[PDB]
Structures are given as C-alpha cells and as structure tokens.
Write an enzyme that holds these catalytic residues in place. Structure first.
Site, PDB file in Angstrom:
ATOM      1  N   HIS A  92      -9.117   2.871  -7.047  1.00 55.70           N
ATOM      2  CA  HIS A  92      -7.862   2.724  -7.761  1.00 55.70           C
ATOM      3  C   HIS A  92      -7.321   1.293  -7.699  1.00 55.70           C
ATOM      4  CE1 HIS A  92      -6.018   3.375  -3.705  1.00 55.70           C
ATOM      5  NE2 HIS A  92      -5.093   2.567  -4.192  1.00 55.70           N
ATOM      6  N   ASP A 106     -12.515   7.883  -4.342  1.00 53.89           N
ATOM      7  CA  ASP A 106     -11.728   6.647  -4.386  1.00 53.89           C
ATOM      8  C   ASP A 106     -12.408   5.625  -3.447  1.00 53.89           C
ATOM      9  OD1 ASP A 106      -9.845   4.911  -5.153  1.00 53.89           O
ATOM     10  OD2 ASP A 106      -8.176   5.700  -3.947  1.00 53.89           O
ATOM     11  N   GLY A 155       0.427  -1.431  -0.776  1.00 57.63           N
ATOM     12  CA  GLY A 155      -0.239  -2.693  -0.483  1.00 57.63           C
ATOM     13  C   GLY A 155      -1.323  -2.550   0.546  1.00 57.63           C
ATOM     14  N   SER A 184      -3.566   0.061   0.494  1.00 61.22           N
ATOM     15  CA  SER A 184      -4.701   0.827  -0.022  1.00 61.22           C
ATOM     16  C   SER A 184      -5.948  -0.047  -0.116  1.00 61.22           C
ATOM     17  CB  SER A 184      -4.404   1.513  -1.355  1.00 61.22           C
ATOM     18  OG  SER A 184      -4.113   0.585  -2.359  1.00 61.22           O
ATOM     19  N   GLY A 185      -7.107   0.593   0.005  1.00 56.77           N
ATOM     20  CA  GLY A 185      -8.374  -0.091   0.055  1.00 56.77           C
ATOM     21  C   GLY A 185      -8.766  -0.498   1.456  1.00 56.77           C
TER      22      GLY A 185
END
Ligand SMILES: O=C(O)Cc1ccc(NC(=O)[C@H](Cc2ccccc2)NC(=O)CCc2cc(Cl)ccc2-n2cnnn2)cc1
Length: 236
Positions: A44, A93, A186, A188-189
């Site tokens: 995402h 994801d 901020g 995420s990932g």
C-alpha cells in the site's frame, strides 16, 4: 509510533526510511533491509507512486533532519508487489524493492533475518515496532526513529476485534488490551522485529489498523513467515 521512545544510533540498523520525491521530498514509508540489494516493505506504500524513479532509500538514519541535499541514498531499480494485493485490509500487503546497487553492511546498516525454517512453532515474546510516524492520529512525521515493545495477540482474538474484516493466517496482530502503544501514520512498511534466542527475526510488516493505539483494536501486520517462499522466489 504511539507511546514510543527515541532510539539511539545503531539500534535498529535494518530499518530504512523510504522517501518519495514527487511533488516534493518527504518520508513515504518504513522498510527493512533483508539482503544486500533488497528491501521488504508494504504494498500500500506505492499507491501514489508513478514509477521507481522518484523513490530514494535512506539507510543509517536516526533523525530525518540528517537528510540533506548531499546525504547519499540508494536508487530503486524495481518495485515488486505481490500479485494478489488489492487493499491493505484484505491482505497480501508485501513488496520488495530491488536497490540499484548493493548495501555494504556496517554497524548502522545491517540485514534482518526472516523467520527461520523450523521456527513456525515459535511463540515470540519480545517484539518491537519501529518508525518515524505520528505519535497520535493527526500529528506529524517524527524526527527521531521511535521504538515501542508490543505483545502479539492470537489471530482468534484479532478477528473478534475486526468482525468486519477477514483476519487470515497471512496476517499477525499485535497490541495491548488497553491501547497506548502501536504503529501510526508513517510507520507502515516498517518492521515488527522479534528477538528469539538473541537473534532478531522479521516477523511482521506494519500494514493497517483501526485508529492508532485504541483499546481492543490491535495493529495488523503482514505475516512474513507465510511469504518466505514468495520472497525467496523473487530474490534468488
Ligand atoms: O503526508 C504526510 O503528512 C506524511 C505521511 C506519510 C505516510 C503516511 N502513511 C499512512 O497513512 C499509512 C497508509 C498509507 C501509506 C502510503 C500511502 C497511502 C496510505 N498508514 C500507516 O503508516 C499506519 C497504519 C496503521 C498501522 C497499524 Cl499496524 C496500526 C494502526 C495504523 N493506523 C490507523 N490509523 N492510522 N494509522 C501518512 C502520512
């Protein structure tokens, strides 16, 4: 990270800050170093991203303010998104960035190991979420990488918390019954990193959740062990 504390230089050296440079430069997402040319992140993250040409990968950063016009970065050669990815809440994801050159590992940039073959059985009791995200809903990207210890919750408890979503075995959930500590906007990932037998494993990728650190609403993370064959396929 909500309820998190500042980290020190060299503390989470697999952590990266992925920047976009369109229409201006800013932190887009977190990432983890898993190989000399490889970053693991969330699908995402690339929603608004026209091509890999605008992406920069910054390794060895504590504070975002260190990133100047001459701070070196790694170019991205490829963005490999899982082919069954649609939205974060419905899974898959997970993405890989191929860097345009290899990382020379130092005390400030190291690889994190994937969950091991043989450890599918393991109960991870020492898990940590890191990042430069908001300390609450409606806030801003934080200068110093933050850290926060968070307990894993069962997929059975997590489903009872998200009766409107399908919580599957390729997700893993983490959060306190009372709230207080969790990933936010901020983060995420980035990694959910767990220490087992003094070795750090990349157990989850920050994906989604309802609000930031609300009670009875755990963070949902891509379940990395369920994607190890997909990662190895793509990275060999
Ligand atoms: O522009 C800025 O001010 C900085 C800025 C930079 C990045 C982001 N990122 C996001 O909104 C992304 C989802 C997303 C990523 C990339 C593109 C589109 C959406 N979401 C997250 O990082 C946290 C998701 C998240 C993960 C987890 Cl395990 C638990 C709770 C949450 N949140 C619930 N409500 N907010 N967060 C937000 C602001």
């Amino acid at each position: 990270i909500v309820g998190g504390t500042a980290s020190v230089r060299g503390e989470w050296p697999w952590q990266v800050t992925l920047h976009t440079t369109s229409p201006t430069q800013r932190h887009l997402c977190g990432g983890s170093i898993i190989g000399n040319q490889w970053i693991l992140t969330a699908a995402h993250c690339f929603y608004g991203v026209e091509s890999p040409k605008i992406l920069r990968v910054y390794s060895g950063i504590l504070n975002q303010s260190e990133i100047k016009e001459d701070t070196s970065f790694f170019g991205v050669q490829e963005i490999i998104i899982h082919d069954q990815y649609k939205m974060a809440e419905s899974g898959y994801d997970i993405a890989l960035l191929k860097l345009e050159t290899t990382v020379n590992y130092t005390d400030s940039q190291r690889p994190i190991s994937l969950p091991s073959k043989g450890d599918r059985n393991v109960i991870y009791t020492d898990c940590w979420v890191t990042g430069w995200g908001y300390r609450k809903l409606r806030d801003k990207i934080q200068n110093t990488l933050q850290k926060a210890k968070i307990p894993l919750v069962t997929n059975e408890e997590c489903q009872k918390r998200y009766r409107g979503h399908k919580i599957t075995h390729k997700m893993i959930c983490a959060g306190y019954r009372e709230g207080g500590k969790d990933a936010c906007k901020g983060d995420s990932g980035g990694p959910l990193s767990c220490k087992h037998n003094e070795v750090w494993h990349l157990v989850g990728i920050t994906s989604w959740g309802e609000g930031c650190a609300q009670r009875e609403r755990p963070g949902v993370y891509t379940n990395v062990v369920e994607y190890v064959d997909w990662i190895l396929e793509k990275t060999q």
